[PDB]
Each structure stands twice: as structure tokens, then as C-alpha cells.
Symmetry: C3
Subunit: 420 residues, 3 copies
């Protein structure tokens, strides 16, 4: 319970209401990002710059493969000793880890049969001559292959190649290769250092492809308009499963999760306004959002979640405990609520809820428009309630509002309430 | 009062001084952003990809117009019942809202006559064939029309169109349309969801126009060098007033505010240094900036404001209350000031103010350069003052400084001050 | 000491270990950024737009040179009066400053002989016709000169110049100049306002050169693969030393620092898990990282540092003091540790350290796989220890793990420990 009838007399008013959703089971797709382009159409003019680029790429990829091969051996070393049907992590060889790292280490082994199927297509992956392409694995699964720089050459150099000289072509292509290297290090740098525990969103991945994430979703067989709820929440993420150093490519597995609606769970918003005490202006201190689950009250940090037109969407169940004074305050003992003095006009003075208006008519102008007379609260009353029994249209500050009727047994009274 | 003479003996020294400015009355201009380009120069080669693009745009715009039409009906439903000269909000139909939402809902109705004037120019808006254009409304007001992709076709495809094949042109244009769609969703996505309460800065708006905000200000009749104080503060912002689904465009109103100088208001900076107590090194805890208005002291969170060479500029009056211990400390009762022990050399040891130097000569080397002898403070004194009565140039740490004269009645004394 | 044997019984477990590194002595290089391009190849077609651009650039540069000339006079006014071999700051003319500002003001004078050598090359700097170039000063030092827009004209306009008309060329170049002006104001705007105290990273500087920082490091004679540890930490930074208003260029000095390994300093990570008290689930509150230097314990805010595979790298020594209750807790008086109640399943239940597993087997399923039987802790015990004396493979939650042997004198006991 939140006992709104006692909260209103201390400036706390009932806002909007939402349901709670959290991430469900996954679905996955395969993508290959090529770092060495198929320059074969202009090959004779640019050989010197190309040979220099390949060595730098290979030096950059060599450390990553040893991190992957190391983690694969800790699981294989277990599976070969014991009869059990599941994968077994060798704890003595690993030595120190959180439960999350052990879980991601077993998932890396579980993904290895796709990586082996990709490795059988190496010569077909090398020979692509388009900016994006689709191929079929022996698993019957499809693979998407991305090749940005061959797109740049097809657009910018080939239509004018009769005007340019051989030295101009070589010098022109050389600067484009170093720009692409700078983009790769900016997008993938953190994942190349810690490949087992790091995930990247599809929006960030697309920065290597001019930011065109709409083409990426399209070639995987989706539509960006249908995926809106998980795309806008940034829940579509990928991770590295394998690296090929001699060919120069990265293989990624990309995940499209379901959403689960939590039963008996509600999120409630609270609106604060100022109020009058014996001639001074004060404000109450409370969190903006509160979570209720099967009568239990709790805090929730919505900065780690996305708010939509009707739902709050989180990656995990971010509920947090609540202190005894705040629980006492929200359950109707207003003497336990904390308060602060007002020194700026930026704090609001009125609000609308269920068609009724609550206002602090000692610090803002309130007038009745039908009879054209001012409205005054006593120096004993903290807040004033505006409904259609007195008159049908009110001026509040510099706005005109029409109001509904009060669902109660008599006149609203706010004289001399308990507070602390 | 801040009683700097007592604060100096506890390491708190007087810094720079600024005046306070807050946002004033507005001025506005009109802009139209087109989502469906005028492809008419290459039309025969790209019809298949164009027809697919238009349906996706229309599906994306259909939800936004219903949010706008819904809010317009809540005001019209009031205006038709009553004689009053101002606009009236229907509170029963709206049900729940903050004062800010009611205010933005009335402003949306007030802007509707410009939207109707724009809607009379629809055929002239469709026929533009340039990246940016100016038109005249029947209000005598001007309108700026933006068309990015027709600029791309004029630059990249038309000069080489004799070299490319029909299939190459179609495939080439198709990827540019999906890239533009990805850019729109990234820039406008939050505003398309909540069009009544959301505002966008001109810098962010320009990301749909290659980031060239200088052209946008130029066609509206301004110069980016004159607008520096409001542009650098990020106070130039726009909001959506209407949407046309069949033609595929968004109409925006853009605001250029005035700045108001608050009378009798001053912002004062404070500089902390370490100090000596009985052989140990300590530091005092105080906020960096303090606000004084007509003798009243208050806190101010300058992270929400911009600091210039002479003024602090804020969007609203962000003043906040101050606790009784901090007020006691700043008004000269140093026994109420809070302190901390020092465990790193990154904390500073000296500072310059009004041509005089204050230093902790037990934790840094202080020497007189004229006589070439060291300077020592007793174990009873917290801080030392360096002025030109003793000698004219000092070495402090690894820097040489020349100093002024002390405006006082005698020798400065820092023995055994009151502290807690 | 951290007395891990008492901490384990309250859910705090030993994580990874790192060494501490801080920034050392500098090394520097010279760079010139040109704001007025060498349009001389298309000059006849674009004169009107070019003359308009130059006046706006000069108006933008005029305020910056007076800030530089003002600070240079405060040092020169000292050096001319006194015999001392070092530079002398005039404190009366400066009036108010922090020790950091005095230090940067003397450094600006120390850099002035390079600025004079650059100023002798003005006609050679103006005549460059390439996107990037190298020149030699009379100091025998090299200078790197950047010219982005001449690169754009060499790539985009000259190969098609027989197809375009004179008016098309002029209009086309004019929009590229205003886009470049918008990019300059976005990258350098804060430094142009406060040129003495502001530094910019090489990644941010490169945004004026299509983001290609790899070319910048290459022409300065480095390789981005060797500089990884300081580049990834973002310690490579530059600052403005001079401005030329009539020619329209900015001169920068760029710094490549060394790293110093602090002796006898270690950073230790801590892993928290939940635990059982009399039937309820609880958690302990402690910082993630702790710093030890020659037996002294301290806090460290690693959000201002970079964490690698083995080292923590900071710009300055960010150590901070620690409270008496936390020191008491970590030195084995667990009655002083603070705790919280658990209301979400997102909190972890087990962890691996030194080949042994610690788990809360009342809130997760624990079973022995060799004998296929469940494991249970009493209602008196907070935590359970899993080692190879009982059986060699365990199921914990939904994962299978193989474990090592306990280095102790007998059975581990967690009954009825002291807590508060």
C-alpha cells in the first residue's frame, strides 16, 4: 500500500503506472568481418602499400588467438577425463574466476562447431568482390560476409580510372587503408584485449560499415521496424568466437533475445510539489519511481533501464532494498518523511491527477474564472484542492484549466497535519 | 560575508569572481526536413528500390501524427465550450500531467497557424532540386527546406553517369537510402516517441546534414560568430510542430533566446591548499563555487551551467540550500569546518592571491633568492605568508615568483588557531 | 595485512593482483594545422567564396593571440629586471592564480624558441599542395604540416573537372569550406577560449583529418602498435604554442611520455558473494579495489585510470585515505563490517579462488557428481568450502567444476562467526 491520501497533504502526488519486463531466451546468427580486402581489380598499381598493410594486421591478430586457444584447453582438459555428458571446467588450471567468467568460458566451447563450419569456407570467404554477401554452410545455416574497402574502390576509383595515373592510384589507396585500421582499433579495441568477457552492440559494430545498421539487419533477414523494442533498448549484442590470422578475419555470433513480462509486478511514479508551513515554503524528499512485487516494496534504479510508453525494460532484475524510514513514510506515517527548504522558483507549485488539481495557493496566484474572484488558503493549511463543486474553470499561475469532481465523503481538510 | 581572514589560516584562499546570467524571452524561425528525396533526375534506373523505401517511411511516421492530433483535441475541446480569450486545457480528458506538460500542450496549439501556412506550400516543398532552399509563406515569414540525398546525387552520380550501367546506378542508390534511414533514427528517435515534451539542439539536428550547422545558421540569416554566447552554451533548440505522412516531412520551430543578467548576484571561487597540524598534513573540505544574492548564501551546481571568461550561464535558476555547519564555517567559526588527512603529493601546497603568496613551508621548500637563505615556519604555525617586506623574489618548490605588499596593521600570525 | 581467512566466512574472497604505474618524463614533436587552404589549382572559379571565408577565420583567431601575448609579457617583465638564470613570474601583474597556472605560464615561455623557428618558414608552410607534408627547421628538428581541403579537391574535383561548369565548381567548394569551419569549432573550441591551460588528445585532434590518427603517428616517425600502452591509456596530448592570424595557422607541441613503475606498491581485487544468517540471505559492503604501499592501506578510484592485463595505469597518484571502520574490517574484526539484505537473484552465490570453490549451498543447488548425492550446510554455517577430499567433481547451480586441495590443518568451520 502507498496510502496516497496522507501523502497528498505533504506535496507527494500520484503519477503514471508501468509494467516490468526482463530479458528472456536467445536466438543467434553468424557474421564474418574481413580486415584484408580483395584488391584484385587494381592490384598492379598498389602492391607496395598492400604488403605493408598485411604485416601490421597479422601482428595485431596474433595475441587474440592465444587467449581463445587457452580458454578452449581448460574445457577440453576436463571433457577427456570424465564420462559426464556436460562440459567440465578444469578449476586447477584456471585458478581464479568469477561465476560469470566460468559461464562465458563454457559458452565459448559450446559455440566451437559453428567456428569449425566457418573454417571450411575459407576460400569462398576470400573471393568475395562485393561490400556485403550471403553464403551457405554445411549446417544449412547462412553466413553474412562484410567487405567495406572493396565497396569504396568500386564507387570512388573504378569509374575515373582512365584519368588517374599509376602513382596517384597507389598513393590514394594507401591512405584509405590506414583510415580503416584506425576505425577498427576504435570500434573493436576493448574486445580484442578481453575476447571472452566482452560484448558489442549492433549499432557500435556498424561503425565499421559507415554506420548502416539497417543493411546489416536486412541481410540477416529482419526488419528494423519490427525489432524496435529490443533495438531501442540496445539488447542486440554480439561476441567473438574465432580469429583467422593468415586470412585476416573475425567471426562473430549475434544474439536476438525474447522479453518476459514479470507477473504481479508494477512500477509507480511520484510527483513532488512545494507546500506551506506557518508562512515558509518546503519540499519533501522521495525517489521518483517505486517497485511493488506481490505487496513487497523496493527501490529500482531506472538509469540502467529503458522507459517506453507503457513498460520499463531492464537487462537484469535491478531491484534494491529500502530503508525503514522510507517504508514508514510511504505507508502513511508522514512524521518520518524528510524535508528541505525552498530557495528557487524552479520548484513546481501545482499538479493534475485523476482530473483534480492540487496547488499551493500561497506561493502562486489561484483564481476562479466563472465568478472572477481570488482563492485563498489559511495559514493553517499546507495544500489546496481544486474541483468542480465550487466553479468549473480555474486560473493557476498563467494557465487556465477545467476540472472534474472529488470522490469523497466531504470537504478536503489539510489543517495542521503531522510532520517531521 | 565570507571572512577570508579566518579562512586563510585553514588553507582556504580567495579565487576568481563572476556574474550570473539566465535565459530570457524567445525568438523563432521555421525549418522543414524532407525524408523522401526528389530522385527525378535518375528515376528510370531506381524505381524498385524507391517504392520499397517510401512504405517504410510512411509506417514510421503514422504513430507520431496520432500523438499530435490527440493533444490538439484536448485544447480544442475546451475552446469550443467557453467564452474566455485564452486557450483552455481540458483536465478530465488529459487525466494525469505535470505543470510542464500542460504548458507544452498549450504551446503546441499556439504554434498551429504556422503549421497551417506550411501545409499550403506542399507542392512547392516537393519540387525542390537542391540540398538547401528558401521559400516565402503568406505570413511574409520565410521557410528553410533541407534535402540531403539530392545533394549526394548531384555530387557523386551525375558527373560520371556515362560510365555506370543501369544496374550499377540502382544498386548504388539503394544503399544510400538505407544509410540515411539509419541516421534519421539515430538523431530523431527519442523525439518521434515523445513529440510534445522533447527538444533538440541545432548541433544534433545538423547530423542529418553532414554536421554542417554553419550553413543552417547562414540560411536563417545569422552568423555563427555573433551567436557565440548562446551557441556555445547549447541554448539554441527546436521542437516538432507537424508531420505530413503522404509527402513524408517534419516541420520544426527553432528558438533563439535572449540572456538576462541577474541583479545583485555574484559567484565566488575558493582555492584549497594543505596545512600543518603539530607535524601532520591536513586538508579542508568545501565546495568549489558559492553563490551570494543580496547577502543570502547558497550552493550552486555548476555542472549544469557553462563558465566563460566572466559569466556563469545557466538554463534555469539552479540555486540550492546550504547546511548550518557550512554557513558557520564560511562566516568565520573555523571549529565547524570538516577536514581530511593527506596521503598523496597530488594535493597543492601554495597559491597566489592579490599579489601575495600563501604556502605550507613544512611540506615544500621555500627560500629567499635575494639573500639566498631558507625560510622556516614553527611547529605552532599552520601556514606562512610571503610578501615584499622581507625580500622581493622567492623560490617556492621549483618556481620563482616576485610578490607585492601586505595591506594590514602588522605581522601575520597563524599560531594555534581554533579548529575542529 | 588483509587476513583473508576471516573475510571468507563473511563472503569476501581474494581476486586478481596488479602492479601500479604512473606518468614519467616527456618527449615532444611539432605540428602545424592550416585553416586557409591552398586553392591555387581551381582559383579562377571560386574567388568570391574564398574571400568571404578568410575574413571569418581572421575574426576567429584575433582573440586567441592576445591571450598568448598577455601571458608572455608577465614572464618577460620579470626576466628583464633580475640576474637569476631561471624564468621569473611577475606576481603583481598576474594577481590571482593556482600553482598549476603559474607552472603552465612558465612552460609557455620555455617553448617560444620553437615558435620563432616555425615563424621563419611561413612562405614554405603556405606553398604546400598535399594533404600532409614534412619540412626541416634550422634547429635540425622536423615539422609536420596538415592541409585537409586540398586533399578533398585533389580527390573529388580535379578528375571530373571537364564535366562540371564554372558555377557548379564555385557552389560545390563553398559548402565544403563551411563544413570544415564547423568541424574546427567542434574540435578546438574549448582550447581557443583558454589556450594556456587546455590540452587535447591525438585521437580528438585527428577528427580534423577524417579521424586518421594512424597517418599522424606515422609521419611523426612512430608506429601505433609499439605505442599501445600510452595510446590506449590516452596519455598522448598536445597544446597550442602560437597562432598566425594573417596566414591562418595554429602551431602545436605534442608530448609522448614515459611510464614509471612504483616500487613496493600492489593493487588487490575483492570478490563478494551472498551468505546465510539464521535462514536469511545477506551481503557485505566493500570497495572493489584496495591499494597497499609499504604496509599502508588506502583507497583508489580506478575510474580515473586504465586497467590492463597486468597493470593499473594512472595520470597522477590518485590514492585516498580510508576510514577506521573499514580498516578494522579488513584487518580481521568482522564485527565492524557493514551489510545489506538481498532481494534479487542477480547477486552471485559462488566463486573460485586458488583452485577451491566457496559457495552458499542454502540458496543454490550443490551436488557431488561422483556419488550423485546432494550437499547440505547446517543452519549454523554461513558458507561452504568445496575441495577434492570429499569428491573430485561438483555441480554448482547449472555448471560442473573440478577442484583442488585445501592447504590447512583440518576441516574448515564457519559456525556462528562474529558479525555486526
Amino acid at each position: 500500500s502507498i496510502h496516497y491520501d496522507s501523502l497528498s497533504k505533504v506535496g507527494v502526488i500520484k503519477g503514471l503506472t508501468y509494467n516490468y519486463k526482463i530479458k528472456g531466451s536467445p536466438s543467434t546468427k553468424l557474421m564474418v568481418v574481413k580486415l584484408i580486402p580483395n584488391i584484385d581489380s587494381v592490384k598492379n598499381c598498389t602492391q607496395k602499400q598492400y604488403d605493408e598493410y598485411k604485416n601490421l594486421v597479422r601482428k595485431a591478430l596474433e595475441p587474440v588467438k592465444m587467449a581463445i586457444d587457452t580458454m578452449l584447453n581448460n574445457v577440453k582438459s576436463g571433457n577427456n577425463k570424465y564420462r559426464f555428458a556436460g562440459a567440465i571446467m578444469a578449476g586447477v588450471a584456471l585458478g581464479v574466476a568469477t561465476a560469470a567468467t566460468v559461464t562465458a568460458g563454457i559458452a565459448l566451447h559450446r559455440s566451437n562447431e559453428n567456428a569449425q563450419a566457418i573454417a571450411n569456407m575459407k576460400s569462398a570467404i576470400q573471393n568475395t568482390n562485393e561490400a556485403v554477401k550471403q553464403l551457405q554452410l554445411a549446417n544449412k545455416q547462412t553466413l553474412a560476409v562484410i567487405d567495406t574497402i572493396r565497396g569504396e574502390i568500386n564507387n570512388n576509383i573504378i569509374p575515373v580510372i582512365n584519368q588517374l595515373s599509376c602513382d596517384t592510384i597507389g598513393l590514394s589507396v594507401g591512405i584509405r587503408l590506414t583510415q580503416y585500421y584506425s576505425e577498427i582499433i576504435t570500434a573493436f579495441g576493448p574486445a580484442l584485449q578481453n575476447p571472452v568477457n566482452t560484448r558489442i552492440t549492433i549499432q557500435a559494430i556498424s561503425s565499421v560499415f559507415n554506420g548502416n545498421f539497417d543493411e546489416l539487419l536486412k541481410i540477416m533477414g529482419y526488419t528494423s521496424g519490427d525489432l524496435y523494442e529490443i533495438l531501442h533498448s540496445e539488447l542486440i549484442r554480439g561476441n567473438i568466437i574465432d580469429v583467422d590470422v593468415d586470412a585476416g578475419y573475425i567471426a562473430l555470433e549475434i544474439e536476438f533475445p525474447n522479453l518476459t513480462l514479470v507477473p504481479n509486478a508494477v512500477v509507480q511514479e511520484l510527483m513532488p510539489i512545494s507546500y506551506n508551513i506557518d508562512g515558509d515554503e518546503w519540499v519533501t524528499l522521495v525517489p521518483r519511481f517505486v517497485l511493488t512485487r506481490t505487496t513487497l516494496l523496493s527501490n529500482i534504479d531506472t538509469s540502467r533501464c529503458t522507459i517506453t510508453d507503457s513498460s520499463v525494460i531492464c537487462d537484469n532484475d535491478y531491484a534494491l532494498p529500502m530503508s525503514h524510514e522510507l517504508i514508514g513514510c510511504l505507508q502513511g506515517d508522514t512524521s518520518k518523511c524528510a524535508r528541505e527548504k525552498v530557495v528557487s522558483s524552479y520548484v513546481p507549485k501545482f499538479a493534475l491527477s485523476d482530473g483534480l488539481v492540487y496547488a499551493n495557493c500561497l506561493n502562486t496566484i489561484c483564481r476562479c474564472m466563472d465568478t472572477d474572484t481570488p482563492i485563498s488558503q489559511s495559514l493553517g493549511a499546507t495544500v489546496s484542492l481544486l474541483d468542480n463543486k465550487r466553479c468549473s474553470v480555474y486560473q493557476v499561475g498563467d494557465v487556465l484549466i477545467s476540472v472534474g469532481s472529488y470522490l469523497g465523503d466531504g470537504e478536503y481538510n489539510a489543517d495542521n497535519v503531522e510532520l517531521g
